[PDB]
Design a protein around this motif. Structure first.
Motif, PDB file in Angstrom:
ATOM      1  N   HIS A   1      -0.813  -1.876  -0.139  1.00  0.00           N
ATOM      2  CA  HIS A   1       0.163  -1.762   0.932  1.00  0.00           C
ATOM      3  C   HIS A   1       0.952  -3.058   1.055  1.00  0.00           C
ATOM      4  CE1 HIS A   1      -1.762  -4.495   3.744  1.00  0.00           C
ATOM      5  NE2 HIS A   1      -0.859  -4.191   4.658  1.00  0.00           N
ATOM      6  N   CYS A   2       2.230  -2.922   1.388  1.00  0.00           N
ATOM      7  CA  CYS A   2       3.111  -4.067   1.549  1.00  0.00           C
ATOM      8  C   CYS A   2       3.061  -4.584   2.981  1.00  0.00           C
ATOM      9  CB  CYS A   2       4.547  -3.701   1.174  1.00  0.00           C
ATOM     10  SG  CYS A   2       5.782  -4.915   1.687  1.00  0.00           S
ATOM     11  N   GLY A   3       3.488  -5.830   3.153  1.00  0.00           N
ATOM     12  CA  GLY A   3       3.466  -6.453   4.460  1.00  0.00           C
ATOM     13  C   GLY A   3       4.780  -6.350   5.203  1.00  0.00           C
ATOM     14  N   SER A   4       5.834  -5.919   4.510  1.00  0.00           N
ATOM     15  CA  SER A   4       7.160  -5.839   5.115  1.00  0.00           C
ATOM     16  C   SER A   4       7.462  -4.438   5.644  1.00  0.00           C
ATOM     17  CB  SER A   4       8.221  -6.276   4.100  1.00  0.00           C
ATOM     18  OG  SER A   4       8.250  -7.687   3.995  1.00  0.00           O
ATOM     19  N   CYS A   5       7.425  -3.434   4.768  1.00  0.00           N
ATOM     20  CA  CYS A   5       7.677  -2.057   5.168  1.00  0.00           C
ATOM     21  C   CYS A   5       6.406  -1.224   5.265  1.00  0.00           C
ATOM     22  CB  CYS A   5       8.649  -1.387   4.189  1.00  0.00           C
ATOM     23  SG  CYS A   5       9.590  -0.014   4.892  1.00  0.00           S
ATOM     24  N   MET A   6       5.269  -1.758   4.819  1.00  0.00           N
ATOM     25  CA  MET A   6       3.982  -1.064   4.871  1.00  0.00           C
ATOM     26  C   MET A   6       4.023   0.272   4.136  1.00  0.00           C
ATOM     27  SD  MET A   6       3.588  -2.289   8.683  1.00  0.00           S
ATOM     28  CE  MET A   6       5.096  -3.224   8.455  1.00  0.00           C
ATOM     29  N   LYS A   7       4.781   0.339   3.045  1.00  0.00           N
ATOM     30  CA  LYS A   7       4.827   1.535   2.208  1.00  0.00           C
ATOM     31  C   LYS A   7       3.651   1.463   1.242  1.00  0.00           C
ATOM     32  CE  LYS A   7       8.685   3.252   1.216  1.00  0.00           C
ATOM     33  NZ  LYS A   7       8.339   4.454   2.022  1.00  0.00           N
ATOM     34  N   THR A   8       2.566   2.152   1.584  1.00  0.00           N
ATOM     35  CA  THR A   8       1.336   2.077   0.809  1.00  0.00           C
ATOM     36  C   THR A   8       1.433   2.968  -0.422  1.00  0.00           C
ATOM     37  OG1 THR A   8       0.211   1.807   2.931  1.00  0.00           O
ATOM     38  CG2 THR A   8      -1.152   2.118   0.987  1.00  0.00           C
TER      39      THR A   8
ATOM     40  N   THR B   1       5.132  -8.051  -6.615  1.00  0.00           N
ATOM     41  CA  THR B   1       6.465  -7.775  -6.096  1.00  0.00           C
ATOM     42  C   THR B   1       6.562  -6.306  -5.703  1.00  0.00           C
ATOM     43  OG1 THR B   1       7.104  -7.677  -8.426  1.00  0.00           O
ATOM     44  CG2 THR B   1       7.763  -9.624  -7.172  1.00  0.00           C
ATOM     45  N   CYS B   2       6.907  -6.050  -4.445  1.00  0.00           N
ATOM     46  CA  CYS B   2       7.033  -4.680  -3.967  1.00  0.00           C
ATOM     47  C   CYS B   2       8.212  -3.992  -4.641  1.00  0.00           C
ATOM     48  CB  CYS B   2       7.206  -4.661  -2.449  1.00  0.00           C
ATOM     49  SG  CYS B   2       7.380  -3.010  -1.739  1.00  0.00           S
ATOM     50  N   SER B   3       7.946  -2.848  -5.271  1.00  0.00           N
ATOM     51  CA  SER B   3       8.997  -2.093  -5.942  1.00  0.00           C
ATOM     52  C   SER B   3       9.961  -1.431  -4.969  1.00  0.00           C
ATOM     53  CB  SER B   3       8.380  -1.034  -6.856  1.00  0.00           C
ATOM     54  OG  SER B   3       7.814   0.021  -6.101  1.00  0.00           O
ATOM     55  N   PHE B   4       9.685  -1.486  -3.668  1.00  0.00           N
ATOM     56  CA  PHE B   4      10.552  -0.907  -2.649  1.00  0.00           C
ATOM     57  C   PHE B   4      11.224  -1.963  -1.785  1.00  0.00           C
ATOM     58  CE2 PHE B   4       6.779   1.670  -3.457  1.00  0.00           C
ATOM     59  CZ  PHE B   4       7.339   2.825  -3.963  1.00  0.00           C
ATOM     60  N   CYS B   5      10.468  -2.954  -1.312  1.00  0.00           N
ATOM     61  CA  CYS B   5      11.048  -4.014  -0.495  1.00  0.00           C
ATOM     62  C   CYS B   5      11.715  -5.074  -1.362  1.00  0.00           C
ATOM     63  CB  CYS B   5       9.969  -4.649   0.387  1.00  0.00           C
ATOM     64  SG  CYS B   5       9.051  -3.480   1.405  1.00  0.00           S
ATOM     65  N   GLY B   6      10.972  -5.630  -2.313  1.00  0.00           N
ATOM     66  CA  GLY B   6      11.462  -6.700  -3.153  1.00  0.00           C
ATOM     67  C   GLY B   6      10.799  -8.041  -2.932  1.00  0.00           C
TER      68      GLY B   6
HETATM   69 ZN   LIG Z   1       7.310  -2.079   0.590  1.00  0.00          ZN
END
Ligand SMILES: [Zn+2]
Ligand SMILES: [Mg+2]
Ligand SMILES: [Mg+2]
Ligand SMILES: [Mg+2]
Ligand SMILES: [Mg+2]
Ligand SMILES: [Mg+2]
Ligand SMILES: [Mg+2]
Ligand SMILES: [Mg+2]
Ligand SMILES: [Mg+2]
Ligand SMILES: [Mg+2]
Ligand SMILES: [Mg+2]
Ligand SMILES: [Mg+2]
Ligand SMILES: [Mg+2]
Ligand SMILES: [Mg+2]
Ligand SMILES: [Mg+2]
Ligand SMILES: [Mg+2]
Ligand SMILES: [Mg+2]
Ligand SMILES: [Mg+2]
Ligand SMILES: [Mg+2]
Ligand SMILES: [Mg+2]
Ligand SMILES: [Mg+2]
Ligand SMILES: [Mg+2]
Ligand SMILES: [Mg+2]
Ligand SMILES: [Mg+2]
Ligand SMILES: [Mg+2]
Ligand SMILES: [Mg+2]
Ligand SMILES: [Mg+2]
Ligand SMILES: [Mg+2]
Ligand SMILES: [Mg+2]
Ligand SMILES: [Mg+2]
Ligand SMILES: [Mg+2]
Ligand SMILES: [Mg+2]
Ligand SMILES: [Mg+2]
Ligand SMILES: [Mg+2]
Ligand SMILES: [Mg+2]
Ligand SMILES: [Mg+2]
Ligand SMILES: [Mg+2]
Ligand SMILES: [Mg+2]
Ligand SMILES: [Mg+2]
Ligand SMILES: [Mg+2]
Ligand SMILES: [Mg+2]
Ligand SMILES: [Mg+2]
Ligand SMILES: [Mg+2]
Ligand SMILES: [Mg+2]
Ligand SMILES: [Mg+2]
Ligand SMILES: [Mg+2]
Ligand SMILES: [Mg+2]
Ligand SMILES: [Mg+2]
Ligand SMILES: [Mg+2]
Ligand SMILES: [Mg+2]
Ligand SMILES: [Mg+2]
Ligand SMILES: [Mg+2]
Ligand SMILES: [Mg+2]
Ligand SMILES: [Mg+2]
Lengths: 69, 50, 114, 151, 61, 91
Positions: free
Chosen positions: F55-62, F37-42
Motif C-alpha cells: 500500500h502507498c502512503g499518498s493515495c493508499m491504493k493497495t 516507486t508507486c506506479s499510480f502516485c509517482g
Molecule cells: Zn498510490
RNA sequence: AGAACUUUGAAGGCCGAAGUGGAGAAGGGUUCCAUGUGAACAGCAGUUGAACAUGGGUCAGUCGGUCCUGAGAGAUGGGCGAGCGCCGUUCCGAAGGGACGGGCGAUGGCCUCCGUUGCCCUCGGCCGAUCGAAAGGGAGUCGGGUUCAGAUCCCCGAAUCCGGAGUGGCGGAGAUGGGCGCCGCGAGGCGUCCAGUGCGGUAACGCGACCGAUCCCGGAGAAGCCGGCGGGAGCCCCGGGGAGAGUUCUCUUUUCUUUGUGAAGGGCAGGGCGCCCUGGAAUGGGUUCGCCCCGAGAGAGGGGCCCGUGCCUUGGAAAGCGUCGCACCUUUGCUGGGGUCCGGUGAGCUCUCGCUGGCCCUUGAAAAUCCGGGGGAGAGGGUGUAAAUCUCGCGCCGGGCCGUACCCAUAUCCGCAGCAGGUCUCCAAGGUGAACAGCCUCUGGCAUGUUGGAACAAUGUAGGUAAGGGAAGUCGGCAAGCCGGAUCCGUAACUUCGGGAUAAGGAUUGGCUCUAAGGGCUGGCAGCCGACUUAGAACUGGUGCGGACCAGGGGAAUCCGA
RNA sequence: CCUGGGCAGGGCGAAGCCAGAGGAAACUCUGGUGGAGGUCCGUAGCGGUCCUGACGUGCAAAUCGGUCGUCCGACCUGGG
C-alpha cells in the motif's frame, strides 16, 4: 448550576413555579442571589452593594428568602 | 466470597441458625437424654463445603 | 506521599477502569474513573487517515444525547463522507453521464450513415 | 494462516437493490479500485473470471473449479497457476495442467480467474529460527513440534 | 541540602564516587538533543532577524 | 562511516544461523523493506503491509504483488502472455 | 486474688513504599462489633484472643450481576440406535405470529375527534431456539458529614441517564413576507392574489430547533507488540510569607507538619489536524532526537475543526482541616481570624493524551445498543388566521430483583493446625546510588514469629580470620578463596568477518578551596534568571580513598551438542 | 482455543540518514546520528546446577540458606 449575568432573566426565573428557595450570600465585595429550582441552581453575583440593597426588596414576597450568615 | 448469590446465602442462613447451643430448659424434661449438641460446626475446624 | 485505594470492586488494571487522581475540596486525593475516549467518524472511500471534522467525537451511546447540529455537516453527505470525496463523486458522476451522452450521439451519427 | 491475500469485491445484485460482498483470492497485479468483470463474455484481463471453455490455449489462470459450480477449488495457494492446454467443442472437455504437473480433464463450463496468485516466492525465505516457525504454525494448527518416531 | 550544595559546587563528584557509565550518568542521546535544539533555534532566530538568507540557512542547518 | 565489511541488514542476527543462510536471506531482506516507486502516485512510498500486500502512503491504493518484491519475474511474463493472447485473434 | 506476655506512658529497635502499610478477586461464612465468665480449646501462662454465652451489624436508577456475543456447550427438523439415548447446529425443515400503509366490518372514551378488535392487499433472508465473562463490549454520582460494626448505598448539598404523556404542560422554531387598489398628512388599516417544510460564510464549516415510510450505504462499538518525542496532571525539589511544634552549654531569620476546589455547564490558555482560501518554488525549500513532506501545490499570510483531565467563574466557603478561646464535663454549640498567598526549575518517578517509526511465512475477536448520509412512498393550514414536526430551553412521574460486614494473611483460603509451603491484581516517598540493586529514615504497622531465667563444657548449625609453604588433601581446586564499579590507554590465536571482548595485561579513585566550557528571557552588541555535567590545576590526610553495601578469576586444549 | 494482566536499570551497536577528507574517475576512509537482535550483565517473575550444605519421628508425605540458568521472549500468569 447556571450563572446569570443579565438583569432581566434572573427575576423571570425567580418568579417561576419551582423557585421555592432563594438565598442571599454576602461576601467581600460580592453578593450572590442563589435561586434553587427543580433541576438547576441559578446564581447571580454582583459587586455593588447599592445595586443589591435596592434589588433585595424587588423579590416576590412569600418565597421564604434566607439570608446566609 | 465478598459477593454471593441468594441461593448460597439462604443455604448459609440455615447453618447460622443451626450453629446454636442447647437450651437449658430441656435438661429437666422427662425422658431427656441429650447433654450437649453434637452438631456444633466451627467455622475454622469443619468446613461445610459450599 | 499519600497512597490511595480503588473505589470499586474491580482490582485489575483492565481497559474498563481508567483512573485519574484528583483533589477533593476536603484536601485529599482520590481516583476518578474516566469514560473511554470516543473517536470521530471516518469517511467512506474518502481520505483514509483523516477523520471527519465538525462532528462530535464521543462514545456511540452518547449520540442519543447530542443534537443533530452537533453530529453532521450542512452539506450533502455531511457526517458520512469528507469534503474532497463529495466533489470527487460530483465531478465523476457529471463526467460519466456526459460521456454516456457522447457515446449515444456517436452511435446515432454512426447509425445515420451505416 | 494463508499466504494468498484476500480481495474484497463488491458487486451489484441483478435482482435486488443491495450490494454483495465476496472474498476472492487476490491475483498478482490488481489494485484497489480496479473494476473486475465476472461473466461469460468478459474481456480477457488479469483478475476477470470467465469459463475455461472460452479462453484460448496456453492461458495462465488460477482459482478454478473441478466441476461447474464448485466455486473456485483448484490452484488456490500463493503463486500457483494452472495451464489450459486443450479444448473440445463437442462433448465439452478441457485439459489443464495443475501445479503438480498432473494433466486433468475437466468440464468446459466451470470458471477460472486469470493471473497468478499474489505472494509468489513465499518459500524462498528461510525461517531462520524456531520462533518464526512457531508463530507461523500457531495460526495454522497444532502440528509443529513433530517429535521423531525413533526417539 | 548541604550535600547538594557541595555537589553543585563540585564536591563528591570525582572518579571515586562514580558507579555508573558516562552514558548512564548523562545520556549521549539527550546531550545531542539539547545541543541540536539550541543550535537549530539559534539558526531560526538568525534567519528571522535578516542576518542570514535562506540559501545560507539551509547549508548551515 | 562504514561499520560492516560484507554483512548488511542481516547483521542484526549476529553470529548465529550460519553464513550461507544469512547470505541468502539478505538478498530479499534488501527488497522487502526498501520503498518502491508507486506506479499510480509517482513517489517512493510502497512499504509492504503484509505478505503480498503493498500500500502507498499518498493515495493508499493497495496492490497485491509478490511476497518479497513488488512484482515477480514470473507474473511479469504471465501478464505479457495474457496481453499477447488477448490481442491475438481478438481474445 | 493472681502479671513478663493484657492496657497506658516513656526509652531502645524491626518491617522502609517489590513492606511486617492501605485496598481488592477466588476461597472462608459470621470469623466483624459491644458486653460478660475464665474448666475445655491458644502446644508455658493469661485479666488476652479469630474460644465460649448473650445482643447487634451488610440500606444503590447512575458499584457489579441482570443485556451482548467470543472459544465452546446445546433442543426441535432430520438421521442413527434393541435401548436410557446419541451424532449433528445449518444440514435433507411449509422452521418470519410482527410492522408501514390502504380498504371492509364492530366496539369504547366528551361518538366533534381518536384508541382498539376481526378480515383482505402490499412489504418484510432467519444468518436459525437457548446458554456461555462479578477482569471482554456495555448510557448515566460526585463533595462533605454521620456509627461500637455501612458508604459513590445513610443525611445534607450539587448533578446526570433511560422510559411516559391518550382530553397531546408551558415557551421558542416551522410564523408570518411580497405585488395591486382604496382610506389616512404621516405612522398605519382594509379587499384580492402569491410565496413561505430555517438561516450565514467563496470556502474548511457555524447556530437554540431544522417534516420524514419501506429500503440502501457508511461510521462508532472494534483492536497486536516494542522503540522514541512532546503536552497535561499528581508526587518529589528550591526560594519567600503565615499558623503550630522541636533544640538552644555555643551557633543557626534555623529544623519539622500544613497552606483546597468534585461531578456537571461556560469562557480562555495548551496540544493535534492527511482541513480551507491568496499565491507557486530550483541558487531548491522550510523541518525532526530520528525520519519525513513538497507541482497530486513547498515557504509565507489569513481561517476552520477535535481533545481541552489545565486555568477562572456557578457549584464554592456557609462544609472540611492546624492554631489560640466562651459555656460544659451524659444539654458541648458557637466565636475570628489565617487558609482559594507570590513563584521557579527539572534527560526526575507514576498516570493519561497525541505524533512518528520499527517488528512478520505472527496482522493481532465477534455480537448487542446507537448515529449519520442517499433516496422521496406520504402528511400538513392554506394566509395579515394558523397546522403537520422539533435530535431546542424548561416543568411533571417512575426506575423493579439480586450481593454489599470482615480476612484476603509467616493467624479468618488450601496443605488433618495460629504449618519458613502454595494462591490473581492497584497505590506506592527521602538519602547514597545508573537504578523498583543493597543499606539507612518518614507516613503506616510490629513484638522477633507455639515460652522465659542462669552459665558459655564437648559435639553441632551458620559467620570471620590465622604466621611459613600454596593444592603437596581429595577420584576430582569439593568447599573456600582472588578479581569484581567507574574513567584513561592496550586488546592475541581463530573466525561464518557479525564475534572472541568487560580477551589478556596496566594507571587513577578521598576531603576541602578553585579555574574554564556546556543555556534561556527582555530592547533597538547590553541587562537578569536557574539544572548539574565535564576537563584541568593547587592544598592536604600515618598511600587511605567502589574505605559499608553493591560485585565477571583468567589463559592454553580435547570430546559432545550449532 | 477465547478473553485480561506483567516484565527496574546498564553493555555491544544492524539497516537507514547527515557532514568532512582523499581520488583524474571508480570509489574509499573518518567523526556523528540512528536504536535492530529468538543479543550480553542484571531486578521482579519463571525454573532448580553445586555445596551430594540444614532438616531428615523436619517448617514441610519434597522445605530452607548461600551459590545458580533465563529475564522482549519458543516469555510468565489469572478466568472461561
Ligand atoms: Zn498510490
Ligand atoms: Mg427414671
Ligand atoms: Mg465434605
Ligand atoms: Mg466488564
Ligand atoms: Mg524432533
Ligand atoms: Mg527414550
Ligand atoms: Mg549511541
Ligand atoms: Mg506496652
Ligand atoms: Mg532505627
Ligand atoms: Mg510496582
Ligand atoms: Mg503487599
Ligand atoms: Mg472475656
Ligand atoms: Mg496454653
Ligand atoms: Mg473479633
Ligand atoms: Mg462463637
Ligand atoms: Mg441518591
Ligand atoms: Mg450496570
Ligand atoms: Mg446434540
Ligand atoms: Mg427425531
Ligand atoms: Mg448471557
Ligand atoms: Mg460523602
Ligand atoms: Mg469499614
Ligand atoms: Mg427525557
Ligand atoms: Mg510522557
Ligand atoms: Mg470542570
Ligand atoms: Mg513535567
Ligand atoms: Mg467491604
Ligand atoms: Mg503460612
Ligand atoms: Mg509464604
Ligand atoms: Mg530513592
Ligand atoms: Mg545523585
Ligand atoms: Mg517473645
Ligand atoms: Mg505464627
Ligand atoms: Mg595461612
Ligand atoms: Mg599470611
Ligand atoms: Mg603463590
Ligand atoms: Mg602445581
Ligand atoms: Mg585420579
Ligand atoms: Mg564452588
Ligand atoms: Mg594457542
Ligand atoms: Mg577467550
Ligand atoms: Mg566561578
Ligand atoms: Mg544444547
Ligand atoms: Mg536475551
Ligand atoms: Mg560473552
Ligand atoms: Mg535470579
Ligand atoms: Mg533449591
Ligand atoms: Mg523445585
Ligand atoms: Mg547435577
Ligand atoms: Mg543433602
Ligand atoms: Mg539430625
Ligand atoms: Mg543469578
Ligand atoms: Mg553466565
Ligand atoms: Mg541473560
Amino acid at each position: 448550576p447556571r450563572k446569570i449575568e443579565e438583569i432581566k432573566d434572573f427575576l423571570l426565573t425567580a418568579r417561576r413555579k419551582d423557585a421555592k428557595s432563594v438565598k442571599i450570600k454576602k461576601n467581600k465585595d460580592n453578593v450572590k442571589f442563589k435561586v434553587r429550582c427543580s433541576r438547576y441552581l441559578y446564581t447571580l453575583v454582583i459587586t455593588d452593594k447599592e445595586k443589591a440593597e435596592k434589588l433585595k426588596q424587588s423579590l416576590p414576597p412569600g418565597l421564604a428568602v434566607k439570608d446566609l450568615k | 466470597s465478598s459477593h454471593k448469590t441468594f441461593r448460597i446465602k439462604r443455604f448459609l442462613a440455615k447453618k447460622q441458625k443451626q450453629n446454636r447451643p442447647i437450651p437449658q430448659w430441656i435438661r429437666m424434661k422427662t425422658g431427656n437424654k441429650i447433654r450437649y449438641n453434637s452438631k456444633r460446626r466451627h467455622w475454622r475446624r469443619t468446613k461445610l463445603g459450599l | 506521599v499519600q497512597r490511595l485505594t480503588y473505589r470499586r470492586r474491580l482490582s485489575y488494571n483492565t481497559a474498563s477502569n481508567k483512573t485519574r487522581l484528583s483533589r477533593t475540596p476536603g484536601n485529599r486525593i482520590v481516583y476518578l474513573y474516566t469514560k473511554k475516549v470516543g473517536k470521530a467518524p471516518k469517511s467512506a472511500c474518502g481520505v483514509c487517515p483523516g477523520r471527519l471534522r465538525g462532528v462530535r467525537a464521543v462514545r456511540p451511546k452518547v449520540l442519543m444525547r447530542l443534537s443533530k447540529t452537533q453530529k453532521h455537516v450542512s452539506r450533502a453527505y455531511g457526517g458520512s463522507m469528507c469534503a474532497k470525496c463529495v466533489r470527487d463523486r460530483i465531478k465523476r458522476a457529471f463526467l460519466i453521464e456526459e460521456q454516456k451522452i457522447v457515446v449515444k450521439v456517436l452511435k446515432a451519427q454512426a447509425q445515420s450513415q451505416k | 494462516g494463508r499466504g494468498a491475500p484476500l480481495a474484497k469485491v463488491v458487486f451489484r445484485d441483478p435482482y435486488r437493490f443491495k450490494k454483495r460482498t465476496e472474498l476472492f483470492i487476490a491475483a498478482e497485479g490488481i489494485h484497489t479500485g480496479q473494476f473486475v468483470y465476472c461473466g461469460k463474455k468478459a474481456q480477457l484481463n488479469i483478475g476477470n473470471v470467465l469459463p475455461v471453455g472460452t479462453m484460448p490455449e496456453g492461458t495462465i489462470v488460477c482459482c478454478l473449479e473441478e466441476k461447474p459450480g464448485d466455486r473456485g477449488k483448484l490452484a488456490r495457494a500463493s503463486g500457483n497457476y494452472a495451464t489450459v492446454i486443450s479444448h473440445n467443442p463437442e462433448t465439452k472437455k478441457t485439459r489443464v495442467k495443475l501445479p503438480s504437473g498432473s494433466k486433468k480433464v475437466i468440464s468446459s463450463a466451470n470458471r477460472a480467474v486469470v493471473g497468478v496468485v499474489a505472494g509468489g516466492g513465499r518459500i524462498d525465505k528461510p525461517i531462520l529460527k524456531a520462533g518464526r516457525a512457531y508463530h507461523k504454525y500457531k495460526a495454522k494448527r497444532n502440528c509443529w513440534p513433530r517429535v521423531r518416531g525413533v526417539a | 541540602r548541604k550535600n547538594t550544595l557541595a555537589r553543585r559546587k563540585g564536591r563528591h563528584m570525582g572518579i571515586g564516587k562514580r558507579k555508573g557509565t558516562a552514558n548512564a550518568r548523562m545520556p549521549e542521546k539527550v546531550t545531542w538533543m539539547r545541543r541540536m535544539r539550541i543550535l537549530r533555534r539559534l539558526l531560526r532566530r538568525y534567519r528571522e532577524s535578516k542576518k542570514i538568507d535562506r540559501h545560507m540557512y539551509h547549508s548551515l542547518y | 562511516a562504514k561499520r560492516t565489511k560484507k554483512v548488511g541488514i542481516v547483521g542484526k542476527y549476529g553470529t548465529r544461523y550460519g553464513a550461507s543462510l544469512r547470505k541468502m536471506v539478505k538478498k530479499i531482506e534488501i527488497s522487502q523493506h526498501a520503498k518502491y516507486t508507486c506506479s499510480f502516485c509517482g513517489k517512493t512510498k510502497m512499504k509492504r503491509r503484509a505478505v503480498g500486500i503493498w500500500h502507498c502512503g499518498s493515495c493508499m491504493k493497495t496492490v497485491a504483488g509478490g511476497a518479497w518484491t513488488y512484482n515477480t519475474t514470473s507474473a511479469v511474463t504471465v501478464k505479457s502472455a495474457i496481453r499477447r493472447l488477448k490481442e491475438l485473434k481478438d481474445q
